[PDB]
Design a protein around this ligand. Structure first.
Ligand SMILES: [Ca+2]
Ligand SMILES: [K+]
Length: 122
């Protein structure tokens, strides 16, 4: 589904403060990672990134292109293409505990300033 700014804000609530990443940062970073599309798939050769968070199948989750992934998150990648972002968040929380916010490249380029464009009021 195609989510909006504030939908994302609501829905990423359990991520608020985890890793010292605020909700506004994540709204921005998700926007600039998947365009708020929960079914977004990016792939090459090679590797494929899945969902709101563009969680990859090289080390994070398993799929048919890389069934031999380390599968850190202990899950099928395609669980990251439905609307329940509960499992997506638990995996992002693991990406954060081991490689940090810079897995998401949009964070530093696009979401390191003008965080006022990413607020949801009331
Ligand atoms: Ca999911
Ligand atoms: K979109």
């Amino acid at each position: 589904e195609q989510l909006t700014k504030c939908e994302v804000f609501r829905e990423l609530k359990d991520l608020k403060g985890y890793g010292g990443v605020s909700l506004p940062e994540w709204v921005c970073t998700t926007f600039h990672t998947s365009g708020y599309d929960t079914q977004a798939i990016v792939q090459n050769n090679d590797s494929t990134e899945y969902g709101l968070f563009q969680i990859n199948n090289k080390i994070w989750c398993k799929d048919d292109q890389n069934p031999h992934s380390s599968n850190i998150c202990n899950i099928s990648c395609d669980k990251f293409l439905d609307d329940d972002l509960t499992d997506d968040i638990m995996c992002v929380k693991k990406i954060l505990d081991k490689v940090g916010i810079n897995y998401w490249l949009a964070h530093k380029a696009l979401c390191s300033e003008k965080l006022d464009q990413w607020l949801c009021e009331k």
